[PDB]
Symmetry: C2
Subunit: 604 residues, 2 copies
């Protein structure tokens, strides 16, 4: 069968045999199935009996598949990658959508509450078919390889009486003593949020609590959070739009270290956006947002947002699912971590099924999850109390102020690679490129580049005072050779990290459905006071390249992830990049090469 | 194939070929399918476009079959007797139970609301499987031969939040301006009652009204009528028990002539009874009750029973379904009838599936509906105001009184054969047996008897004053020959009509599962004042024999129906019967022979 040589120019990839491009763009350090398509992650839980962390995801549009980890770095497939629960039962004859797990449930077994689907199609833009989405229970008695459906109807057969929902799915089970105290619930009551919205009103999270010890009945507590149709946090700059429908709602509570039941309450959601006029059955904008809020009561409970942002700025990033990972788990016991909230963002492989022409049968897989991320409250001290710091409707807020110093402490969402995964990514070969200051325009090669498309690059960029309000662009050119290059840079004129993919892939010239549009995410660098002098915040950059999967992290509070589908074997060189407009000081750049095998017990 | 000769003794009927006993016991003037089993009647409606009255019934445990009538005497099968709606859809993958029809519904078409079943088994005596019974919509666009299910989920997906129901089925749609005025509903609002009960509380009718013009949402109005588990009207003499579960609830309103929207409100129900201790999945008592009541409001509406009885006293009579038949219908236009409420009682053919051994495959049919019955308010004037008239918790009530005459007017439920059916039953040959008074004991042959097992017998029995409190038994012996006889008599010692079936069938000697136990129904004959003298009420008796189907009517307010499965061709003779205890005066007895063919367009 056919010979592949990545030093030779590519054909139209649609002409190659099935499976011939299996390895071409495939990551080694990310969660994705053995083959085929990955959809929304869900079902994650820690098994209290074994300590193993279980992860799950929709697989091939035909149910939920799953894997375990004892270290939060590497994974073991359950049921050989085949689905632990499939459609075709009485409650879910057409489909299985997201569900979440009560780890210590019916008979002390993991108990899945999930969206069972009986009628398609389903979309916020069209009229809703009554009973199309219900919430049903299943239980695993075999260690999470098979979830057996209860032989009864759904436990939540529909939305509240006469509600004209846009959607009613993705039930997310969670505990919270702040809710308990506000609602006089029994201690350690399980809550469920269901995500969707209302036609002619707008997106919403529907809130419930268990009524009975049996998980059979769920008492409706109201739309604890809802926003008008296509409205937006602030003026729309820092947290996209609330848009036409909420999906994949997660609810959890954080402090400075990780997860805390008494901590500040957060939610992550997908929003489904669109231009006007609306194109039937099309969601053109898939925003992956996080939201901080205060929960109060005046009859019924409300979640009132006080700041919001993106969990990942990638066009193709969406549908994140996360779970409490307790300190007692196997991974946390090995690493000494406190209680955490670990979230896996989904990276759709085909633009949410809008990449017609992509050589899908050649690759024989579609999509990945991003690296597990730890979520925590992040504080930014010694920020200069000016208009940059004080902007309303943004992704941070002032929590204290020092009139004498002229400073504020800021608060925002901390987003970083989970620690055991980060350390396993840095495990191999390790070299440093010298710091330097650049004033003129162009790319300057590193003295040494990684020899393969599997690396981490870490660097600090320091900008001088004149950078503010200039047309400066500075960063790195990666995955470069004669025929290809990808540029990642910060741009002050629109306060953004940009990924320029115009030259990323030689395959995009010969083949349809290989996207080359720019990716972008907003990032403000504040003014800070250190050693008694005022300066622009250091841009602390971490780039993880995993064959075709690029994740760009910054300052412990920013992520932008995308596909970088470079063809040529030589497209591995790294250079400094600066457009010449002002100057920039690069610290020493660390490069770690090779990453690690996240699936050590797989063949491929 | 085998020769049948009804002058020769029967074999064990279980040894004969399949279908060989098709005609043996089969009626000609009753509603039953072309072959196979009949279950609960339902689905009846008048088509406003054609004027045809449609009847329906469960058929072979596999959906609802239907037929039409233009005269309320004869019927035409729809869809050749095959079901107009079957199980195996998304909402009803396991079964279809009773439903009722809004005649002028979605797109002005007949619209069925019915119980769609997803989980079996279902019974009041066991724990209820969540979601086993829902209420779904279907619509017929082809004149009632096929009801197309709406391609959506159920419109009532379950009982109210956390209710531990015994049952939740048999939705009965009805209109009522008395309810409209009490509830401030829109004029001509459709109501639905659903029948069942609650574990640890008792049987109930759950009441709803349409929320929207679309029939999509049904607003819950409470348990408008409920009774404690296994309680009873009065002391249990005149209306059985309310028992452990209500089934087949009908609601309607009557005056003296027939149906009236502003009239007195009535309901008919089956009750499921049992001995203590309860045998799992067994209902041993199937009572077919009617109930009169007043409807009032104190927050939510209540139906408060003021009298109750049996619609039919037959052990095997149950599950009646009826419908408003307007004066504008085809049958009513021909007969000049006002608005009516026509009810068909079910006569189970096999003791509600407890007649093991019966030669079912030999007969190739099971069960029938009884003759259509007109329900109306019946007044009994000039009754002597004594303790017989004044008994509480009975099947009548005093509505006015005359202190001077020493009398009361009574009110009760009028039950008679629908008029066009009655006239078609009397259509043929017609002869009279002379009146006589009998004082000694024994049977006295009629001078002429009918030559076949298809006849109506009408007679008046007048009892002298000494009959009261005596051990008198008087009536008729029918279907008699050397080897067989059936006796129908009134008995003062327990105020009952009795059917003695001990000698009815020679087949019961040779064959299993042919019931020969006595049937009974309570009937009080009041003291009346006529021509200025006091007397025992005339017993006005009507017996309709339709091969094996016996229906006994009395005084326009009593029905007792049963199976009389006589074998020998000669078992057709009629005699007077009197046990000698006192005396009895028989008026002239009318006998009409042959009845009529209720299925003129069938082969068999
Ligand atoms: Na996105
Ligand atoms: Na009965």
């Amino acid at each position: 069968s056919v010979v592949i040589d990545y030093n030779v120019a590519p054909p139209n990839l649609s002409t190659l045999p099935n499976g011939s491009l299996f390895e071409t763009w495939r990551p080694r350090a990310h969660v994705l199935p053995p083959n085929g398509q990955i959809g929304d992650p869900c079902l994650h839980y820690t098994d209290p009996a074994t300590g193993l962390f279980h992860v799950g995801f929709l697989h091939d549009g035909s149910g939920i598949s799953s894997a375990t980890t004892d270290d939060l770095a590497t994974y073991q497939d359950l049921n050989q990658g085949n689905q632990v629960i499939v459609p075709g039962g009485i409650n879910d004859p057409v489909a299985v959508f997201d569900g979440s797990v009560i780890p210590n449930g019916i008979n002390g077994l993991p108990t899945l509450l999930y969206t069972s689907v009986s009628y398609l199609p389903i979309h916020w833009s069209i009229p809703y078919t009554r009973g199309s989405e219900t919430q049903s229970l299943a239980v695993s008695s075999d260690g999470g390889s098979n979830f057996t459906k209860l032989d009864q109807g759904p436990v939540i057969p529909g939305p509240p009486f006469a509600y004209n929902v846009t959607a009613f799915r993705d039930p997310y089970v969670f505990q919270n003593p702040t809710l308990d105290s506000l609602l006089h619930s029994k201690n350690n009551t399980w809550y469920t949020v269901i995500s969707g919205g209302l036609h002619e009103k707008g997106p919403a999270q529907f809130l419930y609590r268990q009524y009975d010890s049996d998980f059979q009945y769920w008492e409706y507590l109201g739309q604890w959070w809802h926003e008008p149709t296509n409205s937006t946090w602030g003026n729309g700059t820092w947290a996209g739009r609330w848009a036409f429908n909420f999906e994949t709602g997660n609810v959890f509570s954080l402090d400075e270290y990780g997860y805390n039941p008494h901590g500040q309450i957060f939610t992550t959601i997908g929003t489904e956006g669109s231009d006007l006029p609306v194109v039937p059955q099309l969601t053109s904008i898939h925003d992956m947002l996080w939201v901080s809020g205060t929960v109060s009561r005046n009859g019924s409970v409300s979640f009132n947002p006080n700041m919001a942002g993106f969990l990942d700025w990638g066009f193709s990033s969406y549908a994140a699912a996360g779970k409490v990972l307790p300190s007692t788990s196997l991974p946390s016991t090995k690493s000494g971590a406190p209680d955490r909230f670990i979230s896996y963002v989904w990276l759709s492989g085909d633009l949410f099924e809008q990449a017609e022409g992509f050589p899908t049968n050649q690759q024989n897989w579609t999509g990945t999850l991003l690296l597990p991320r730890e979520l925590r409250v992040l504080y930014i001290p010694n920020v200069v109390d000016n208009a940059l710091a004080r902007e309303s409707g943004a992704s941070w807020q002032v929590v204290s102020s020092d009139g004498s110093a002229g400073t504020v402490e800021l608060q925002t969402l901390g987003i970083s690679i989970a620690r055991e995964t980060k350390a396993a990514l840095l495990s191999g070969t390790s070299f440093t490129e010298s710091g330097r200051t650049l004033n003129s325009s162009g790319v300057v090669p590193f003295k040494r580049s990684p020899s393969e498309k599997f690396f981490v690059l870490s660097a600090q960029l320091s900008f001088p005072a004149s950078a503010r309000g200039s047309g400066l662009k500075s960063g790195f050119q990666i995955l470069s050779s004669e025929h290809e290059s990808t540029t990642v840079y910060y741009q002050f004129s629109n306060e953004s990290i940009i990924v320029d993919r115009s030259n990323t892939s030689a395959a995009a010239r010969t083949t349809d459905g290989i996207d080359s549009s720019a990716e972008a995410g907003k990032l403000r660098l504040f003014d800070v006071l250190n050693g008694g002098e005022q300066a622009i915040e250091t841009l602390d950059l971490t780039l993880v390249v995993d064959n075709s999967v690029l994740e760009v992290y910054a300052n412990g509070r920013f992520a932008l992830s995308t596909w970088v589908r470079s063809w040529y074997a030589n497209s591995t060189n790294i250079s400094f990049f600066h457009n010449g407009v002002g100057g920039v000081a690069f610290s020493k750049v660390t490069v770690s090469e090779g990453l690690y095998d996240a699936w050590p017990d797989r063949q491929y």
